[PDB]
Design a protein around this ligand. Structure first.
Ligand code: NI
Length: 537
């Protein structure tokens, strides 16, 4: 109440606020949530934070409806420190092309635009860096990495950054593909980041601490060798080679939560171990007469979120459900609950196939009813990942199937030179007459922001990923594709990052068995010239 400095956090009650609050408490501060302007007064607020996630309009409409515009402007005029995060940063601008009718605080007179997806995957999902400059602030280090997850940004050109400079704005730039954009801003008492510091591990914790203590630490005296090693070479569009750690969350005989078939601390402690070992992301595969509110998976997320300052993904059970009391609970509401519990992204499996089939039936259109459509409209494409389980099917020619085929280097049994990948549902138990090409393209059109490409037939083989499958899906969509299933050693990650256009690599069993840690994979990739996040607490 006064035993530690209080940080007021504006809470529009949407999305993951667990990470930010836990990050602030971890730094030795007390959090005071401000859900309504009655919850805070200017004079008694010394540190204000304006977090935001999701669709621009979805956030700003909520924020202004609750009556926060005046109290935010008044607080800013008081000259006291304010920090905006993500949409919190975007709210300082004139508006965003994402929500054309929404307005912004207009401190920066231009609107946020969408990244050019003709040259690179959109949304940008990953670890980018701030371009070296003489006017960085709050410890922003060009040789460290921060986690960005967005489709929209304040894309810069010579005129805009000059006007900003003449305006007295200090800008931290970043580049994705050939486009330069605002990573962070600083003018007088206003500080804001496009990246999520609470999702950027220690490097992110440092930025938050630097804002709270109002300090701009000099960046470390890096050696010319370290600089050449740590600098962004703009390989992979400027994003590091993203290593994802995955674990299952099962229910055992005693009704407890486990990761392995026979033995809720276990899934939580393994997630913490993954983070502590360099995981850039932690994915939970939820395979567990319980009311929603009491879904233990949500407790796993809430507990994991206390110390894991990296993106958390949850897959399984994110669908229209019927609660114990018959309450009809939409996928959107189920997702919102997981998000508020600590998840940053939800993975859609079975319903994605249903959505894709309906998509083609309707003449390559969505009716806005799919969980892909509802969750992405509210939280953006970046909050939705599609879990695909393809199986190779050989054919003599494109004439033997309705589905899109590709010429393979590995001919079939009867000498077939072409193949398509058939998609499965219900944990891979049922096949559908839908190819992965058709499935991913439809899901992308419906608003999916990422594809989790599992290679069933490679699952548990520890022989590497299905390279042709990765390339086939990369040819199909423009959204980021995660290579999954088959990884056993660090070389498998190297092979995926150098021989395919894979946007990320996920590991499960190899990390769970302790054969290798994420850092083992990273050290190996590092040694081979690839750029990877190397951050520790
Ligand atoms: Ni106190």
């Amino acid at each position: 109440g006064s035993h530690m400095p209080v940080v007021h956090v504006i809470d529009v009650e949407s999305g993951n606020l667990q990470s930010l609050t836990n990050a602030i408490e971890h730094l030795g501060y007390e959090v005071q949530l401000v859900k309504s302007p009655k919850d805070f007064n200017i004079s008694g607020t010394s540190r204000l934070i304006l977090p935001g996630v999701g669709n621009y309009g979805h956030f700003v409409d909520n924020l202004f409806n609750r009556g926060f515009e005046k109290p935010i402007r008044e607080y800013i005029e008081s000259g006291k420190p304010i920090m905006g995060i993500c949409v919190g940063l975007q709210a300082l601008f004139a508006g965003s092309v994402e929500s054309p009718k929404s307005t912004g605080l207009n401190y920066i007179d231009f609107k946020l635009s969408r990244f050019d997806d003709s040259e690179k995957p959109v949304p940008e999902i990953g670890w980018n860096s701030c371009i070296p400059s003489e006017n960085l602030f709050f410890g922003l280090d060009p040789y460290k990495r921060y986690y960005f997850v967005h489709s929209f940004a304040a894309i810069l050109n010579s005129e805009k950054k000059k006007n900003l400079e003449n305006d007295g704005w200090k800008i931290a730039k970043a580049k994705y593909g050939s486009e330069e954009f605002i990573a962070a801003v600083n003018k007088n008492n206003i500080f804001a980041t496009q990246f999520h510091p609470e999702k950027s591990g220690k490097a992110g914790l440092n930025v938050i601490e630097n804002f709270l203590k109002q300090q701009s630490p000099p960046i470390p005296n890096y050696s010319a060798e370290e600089k050449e090693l740590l600098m962004n070479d703009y390989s992979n569009y400027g994003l590091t080679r993203r290593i994802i750690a995955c674990l299952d969350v099962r229910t055992n005989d005693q009704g407890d939560l486990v990761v392995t078939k026979g033995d809720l601390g276990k899934p939580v402690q393994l997630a913490q171990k993954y983070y502590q070992q360099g995981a850039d992301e932690v994915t939970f595969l939820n395979i567990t007469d319980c009311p929603l509110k009491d879904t233990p998976m949500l407790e796993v997320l809430k507990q994991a979120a206390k110390t894991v300052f990296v993106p958390l993904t949850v897959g399984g059970g994110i669908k229209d459900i019927v609660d114990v009391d018959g309450t009809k609970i939409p996928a959107l509401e189920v997702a919102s609950l997981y998000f508020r519990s600590g998840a940053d992204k939800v993975s859609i499996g079975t319903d994605a196939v249903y959505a894709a089939e309906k998509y083609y039936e309707l003449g390559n259109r969505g009716d806005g009813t799919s969980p892909i459509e509802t969750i992405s409209k509210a939280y953006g494409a970046q909050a939705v990942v599609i879990s695909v389980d393809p199986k190779r099917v050989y054919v003599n020619s494109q004439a033997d199937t309705k589905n899109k085929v590709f010429e393979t280097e590995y001919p079939g049994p009867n000498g077939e030179k072409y193949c398509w990948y058939q998609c499965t549902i219900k944990g891979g138990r049922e096949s559908r007459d839908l190819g992965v090409w058709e499935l991913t393209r439809a899901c992308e059109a419906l608003g999916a922001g990422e594809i989790l490409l599992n290679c069933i037939d490679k699952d548990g083989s520890n022989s590497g990923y299905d390279l042709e499958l990765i390339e086939h899906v990369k040819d199909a969509v423009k959204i980021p594709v995660i290579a999954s299933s088959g990884a056993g050693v660090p070389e498998h990650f190297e092979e995926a990052f150098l021989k395919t256009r894979a946007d990320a690599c996920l590991g499960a069993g190899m990390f769970h068995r302790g054969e290798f840690t994420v850092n083992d994979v990273k050290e190996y990739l590092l040694e081979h010239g690839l750029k990877v996040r190397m951050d520790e607490e």
